[PDB]
Amino acid sequence: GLTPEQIIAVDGAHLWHPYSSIGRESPVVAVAAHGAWLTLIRDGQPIEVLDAMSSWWTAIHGHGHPALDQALTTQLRVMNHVMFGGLTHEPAARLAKLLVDITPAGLDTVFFSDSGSVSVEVAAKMALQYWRGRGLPGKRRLMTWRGGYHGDTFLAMSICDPHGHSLWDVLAAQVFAPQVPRDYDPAYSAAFEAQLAQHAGELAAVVVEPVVQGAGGMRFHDPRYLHDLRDICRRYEVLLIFDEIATGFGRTGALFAADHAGVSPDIMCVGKALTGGYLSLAATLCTADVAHTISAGAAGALMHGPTFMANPLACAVSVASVELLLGQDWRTRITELAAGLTAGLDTARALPAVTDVRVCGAIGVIECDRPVDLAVATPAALDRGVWLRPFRNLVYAMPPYICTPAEITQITSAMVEVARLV
């Protein structure tokens, strides 16, 4: 049993954190999460704050949600897990159907896995094996544009932003296109196609985050670009792959950002909010064509099998979550979060340190001119009862979908002061 002063001592000593260095920077103890609220121990005392980041994209329905909690315990009463090797089960099949149907059409197979990162490698694997089935070992490189993020595994890092993972001669060398504009310039697509053109025969795929680039720098672009990529890929026989591991499940404003242009990719990756922030789970989806080409090509299978593939607990709770999203009118509300952030953040545009304000669904961004100092911003936000984690020059929120209108006021307002704080 451990006190907060014990967690803190045990933590510093023995735990890594993300982009962390044992012995530098300073985490804060969490002791409860419920609905849209955390209990952080600050100065010996428990305090209430809004999970403004949805624990990095995952708590779409907030923490401790009755439907999601129950999906778990009841699953736990029946079956906790079985190897997915030679075995199948109800949550895997329900999630799959659910996934197959609510996704960009044509995506009707489902490869389950445990993290976004792995979910990405699997997609690569499909792509590579796909063309190997099609007698084109030549196709094995990955074209993307700049500012993208796809996880911290050595292949995913490979299509992460090179001049800003992080810059590595150890990752694969991939085709990068320059950085995709916010507004629709038809000439960027032109350049993109021309680049892909010199590389077509050796490009197994093009990987992209649809409409919104998350950890790359909370950047948006015009939904008409994905239309251009679809065609470009279609006319050059290059697979198109969406990484919807951040965008997915209502976050941008539609069900998947892909749907903002009504485009369907050959391969799709989803994670983060898939289980409503309860457990690690990912999925990788591909069109029947891609799957029938793997199976039938040499090796006759997709050589990938995680130990916890299709884990019943993870699926079960995810069934709830997905169902929960679909069974309410999610569209009206994401819109209203968008409304709420837009109104609440507009004041930030008149601040000297603020370079841009952008909202897209339940995604509110304040781009500054300096990098934001977590040493000042984090207390600040905490002082105003909100969990905020700036990154680079961005002060952003990605609230749980069940935040009340006033709860979205707190969040926008706390963000504003942080920005004002320079």
Ligand X SMILES: *Cc1c(COP(=O)(O)O)cnc(C)c1O
Ligand Y SMILES: NC(=O)c1ccc(-c2ccccn2)s1
Active site residues: 19, 149, 243, 272
Spell out, one character per residue from 273 to 302, where the chain touches a second copy: x when CB under 8 A holds, - when not. Answer: ----xxxxx------x--xx-xx----xxx
Ligand-binding annotation for 117, yes or no, is yes
Q: Is 116 annotated as a binding residue?
A: yes
376-415 residues in contact with ligand Y (CB under 6 A) are 391
Give the largest Cα separation in the chain, rounded.
64
Kindly determine how many residues on this chain lie close enough to bind ligand X according to the rule CB under 6 A: 18
Radius of gyration of the chain (CA): 22
Stretch that binds a second copy, among 95-103, 261-269, 320-328, 329-337 (CB under 8 A): 95-103
85 binds a second copy (CB under 8 A): yes
Residue closer to a second copy (CB basis): 52 or 258: 52
Q: Which of residues 359-418 bind a second copy (CB under 8 A)?
A: 374, 378, 387, 389
Distance CA 119, CA 99 (A): 15
Q: Does 307 bind ligand Y (CB under 6 A)?
A: yes
Beta bridge partners of 392: none
Query: Where do we find the tokens 């600050």?
Result: 42
**Is 27 near ligand Y (CB under 6 A)?**
no
Q: What residue 104 binds from a second copy, ligand Y, ligand X, none (CB within 5 to 8 A, per partner kind)?
A: none
Q: Which stretch binds ligand X (CB under 6 A): 145-153, 329-337, 369-377, 380-388?
A: 145-153
CA angle 375, 381, 382 (to 5 degrees): 90
DSSP designation for 95 = H
Nearer to a second copy, 165 or 358 (CB): 165
User: String of b and e for 16-47 (b: at least 16 CB within 10 Å)?
Assistant: eeeeeeeeeeeebbbeebebbbbebbeeeeee
- Written as one letter, the residue type at 109 is T
Query: b or e along 104-113 (b: 16 or more beta carbons within 10 Å of the residue's beta carbon)?
Result: bebbbbbbbb
Task: Select the residue whose beta carbon is closest to ligand X and give its number.
Answer: 116
- Per-residue mark of binding to ligand Y, 44-63 (x: CB under 6 A): ------------x-------
Any contact of residue 243 with ligand X (CB under 6 A)? yes
Least distance in angstroms from the C-beta of 215 to ligand Y:
4
d(CA 10, CA 5): 9
Long-range pairs of 69-75 with CB within 8 A, sequence gap ≥ 24: 70/320, 71/316, 71/317, 71/319, 71/320, 71/321, 72/278, 72/313, 72/316, 72/317, 74/316, 75/312, 75/313, 75/316, 75/317
CA dist 401 and 403 (Å) reads 6
| Residue 227, contacted partner among ligand Y, a second copy, ligand X, none, CB below 5-8 A by kind | none
> Are 118 and 154 within 8 A, CB to CB?
no
243 binds, among a second copy, ligand X, ligand Y, none (CB under 5 to 8 A by kind): ligand X
Judged by beta carbon distances under 5 to 8 A according to partner kind, the member of ligand X, ligand Y, a second copy, none in contact with residue 94 is a second copy
Amino acid at 254: A
- Cα 421 to Cα 339: distance, rounded to the nearest angstrom: 25
Q: Choose one: 71-79, 100-108, 112-120, 406-414; the region binding ligand X (CB under 6 A).
A: 112-120
Of 85, 163, 186, 406, which lies in the binding site for ligand Y, with binding defined by CB under 6 A?
85
385 is in an annotated binding site: no
The binding site for ligand X (CB under 6 A) comprises 115-117, 120, 149-152, 209, 214-215, 243, 245-246, 271-272, 306-307
The binding site for ligand Y (CB under 6 A) comprises 18, 56, 83-85, 215, 305, 307, 309, 391
Binding residue ranges for S-adenosyl-L-methionine? 56, 149, 305, 389
